Enzyme design. Structure first.
Site, PDB file in Angstrom:
ATOM      1  N   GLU A 112      -0.484  -4.146  -3.690  1.00  0.00           N
ATOM      2  CA  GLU A 112      -1.821  -3.911  -4.343  1.00  0.00           C
ATOM      3  C   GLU A 112      -1.913  -2.167  -4.034  1.00  0.00           C
ATOM      4  OE1 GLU A 112      -4.077  -6.329  -1.176  1.00  0.00           O
ATOM      5  OE2 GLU A 112      -4.227  -7.709  -2.745  1.00  0.00           O
ATOM      6  N   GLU A 144      -0.716 -13.920  -3.784  1.00  0.00           N
ATOM      7  CA  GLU A 144      -1.674 -13.987  -2.665  1.00  0.00           C
ATOM      8  C   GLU A 144      -3.135 -14.951  -3.425  1.00  0.00           C
ATOM      9  OE1 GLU A 144      -3.379 -10.671  -0.414  1.00  0.00           O
ATOM     10  OE2 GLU A 144      -1.555 -10.001   0.007  1.00  0.00           O
TER      11      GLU A 144
END
Ligand code: NA
Ligand code: NA
Ligand code: NA
Ligand code: NA
Ligand code: NA
Length: 444
Positions: free
Chosen positions: A163, A351
């Site tokens: 991320e 995720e």
């Protein structure tokens, strides 16, 4: 006969600072998050990861728990401050933990997926300028090369960064995450140095030519809807989509930053870090893309300020994060990647999950029906993507266990396993039992 093939990976995910604890043991020095969580007002009730889930000491129990659930793959991150606790100072005791962790995984038939950087930058690196100092490309390369060389026999699936939107914009522009700056120009330069560091690790990786080993990156992606069909809302959505998604997808997969965003950001900050040589390193071919997906955004034009779109609440069910439960965007994003960026390249959901108000009832159970239904709806969209020709190779639920949720501390619970932090007891939630059945039957 199976909705998910025998080779499809049903996984779960964690991150080092969120679960390990043992923050001052076996040579580990402070990360930027140890420091940030001790600054007044930065983290909910001054929570920190000193102890967290104590996974550093309890990892054998946690692996046994995953084996009893039938988990096929485990995504975790490696703590740079355990491996290089000081600049140029390798710590074999830190490496030893990840060897015994991954040895345990392999011996229990769980495939390791290792995230090299999941936000726990060593404090010594930040004190030298951190992601704002282009020399970090070499420090990160040295770190990644040491992992590949020491763990290449243990780990065959590598993720450079988790991320980078969070490590750049959320950490340096919005200021919610460590180190907590609020400066658009700094966040833009950090985004570039993160991508360049990714590129350096990929260069090193290819030069090693490790047998049967793959490398990728993990991006948090959303889908942006305009609140109306107006031109104003269409531009607002384009900017929001460039900010979250295309600012990272375009340099990685097109070798060029999105020109509309370069021009937009250029009205407010310097964008002179862009050059051909760097974009060539950034856009080196990957083996897979990891997608972190949680929610969508519905946006309406704001007041012509910097990134000031109004967030519209469409009135649908939400998690404890305030995030809309909108499973269709999982399919839409995977399809967008297939048609616009990654084409036939393997994809993983690295995720997806949800925070709900979990309580252990008098029966000793956690009846998290909302999380069962959340995961059911999203796995049904993964199945739909597969049946429409998408190259999805696996799906990691965030998270194996409740953990330290960054600026929220322990107040947000994402686990399929509940953690009683006073005793460190693990309690399987109903969602874990549901997932165990999904893995066993491969049917949804
Ligand atoms: Na920790
Ligand atoms: Na603290
Ligand atoms: Na690629
Ligand atoms: Na791959
Ligand atoms: Na939906």
């Amino acid at each position: 006969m199976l909705d998910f093939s025998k080779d499809f990976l049903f996984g779960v995910a964690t991150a080092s600072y969120q679960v390990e604890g043992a923050y001052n043991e076996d040579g580990r020095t402070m990360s930027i998050w140890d420091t940030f969580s001790r600054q007044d007002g930065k983290v909910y009730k001054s929570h920190n990861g000193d102890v967290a889930c104590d996974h550093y000491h309890l990892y054998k129990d946690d692996v046994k728990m995953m084996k009893d659930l039938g988990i096929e793959a485990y995504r975790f991150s490696i703590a740079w401050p355990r491996i290089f606790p000081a600049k140029g100072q390798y710590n074999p005791k830190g490496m030893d933990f990840y060897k015994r962790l991954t040895d345990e995984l392999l011996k229990n038939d769980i495939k390791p997926f290792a995230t090299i950087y999941h936000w726990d930058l060593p404090q010594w690196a930040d004190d030298l300028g951190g992601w704002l100092n282009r020399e970090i490309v070499e420090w990160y390369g040295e770190y990644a090369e040491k992992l590949f060389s020491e763990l290449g026999g243990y780990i065959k699936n590598w993720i450079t960064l988790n991320e980078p939107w969070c490590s750049s914009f959320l950490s340096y522009f919005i200021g919610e995450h460590a180190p907590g700056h609020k400066d658009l120009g700094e966040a833009l330069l950090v985004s570039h140095n993160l991508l360049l560091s990714h590129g350096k690790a990929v260069e090193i990786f290819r030069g090693l030519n490790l047998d049967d080993s793959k490398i990728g990156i993990t991006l948090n992606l959303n889908e942006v809807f305009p609140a109306s069909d107006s031109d104003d809302d269409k531009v607002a959505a384009q900017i929001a989509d460039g900010f979250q998604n295309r600012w990272f997808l375009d340099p990685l997969f097109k070798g060029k930053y999105p020109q509309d965003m370069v021009e937009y950001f250029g009205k407010y900050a310097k964008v002179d870090f862009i050059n051909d040589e760097d974009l060539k390193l950034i856009s080196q071919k990957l083996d897979f893309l990891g997608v972190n997906y949680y929610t969508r955004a519905v946006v309406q034009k704001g007041n012509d300020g910097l990134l000031d779109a109004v967030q519209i609440d469409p009135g649908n069910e939400r998690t404890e994060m305030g995030w809309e439960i909108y499973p269709e965007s999982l399919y839409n994003i995977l399809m967008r990647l297939k048609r616009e960026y990654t084409y036939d390249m393997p994809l993983y959901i690295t995720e997806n999950g949800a925070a709900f108000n979990d309580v252990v009832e008098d029966d000793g159970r956690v009846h998290d029906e909302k999380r069962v239904e959340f995961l059911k709806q999203h796995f049904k969209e993964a199945k739909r993507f597969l049946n429409d020709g998408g190259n999805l190779k696996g799906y990691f639920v965030w998270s194996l266990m409740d953990n330290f949720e960054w600026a929220h501390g322990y107040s947000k619970r994402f686990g399929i396993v509940y953690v009683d932090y006073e005793t460190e007891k693990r309690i399987l939630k109903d969602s874990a039992l549901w997932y165990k059945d999904l893995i066993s039957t491969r049917t949804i």
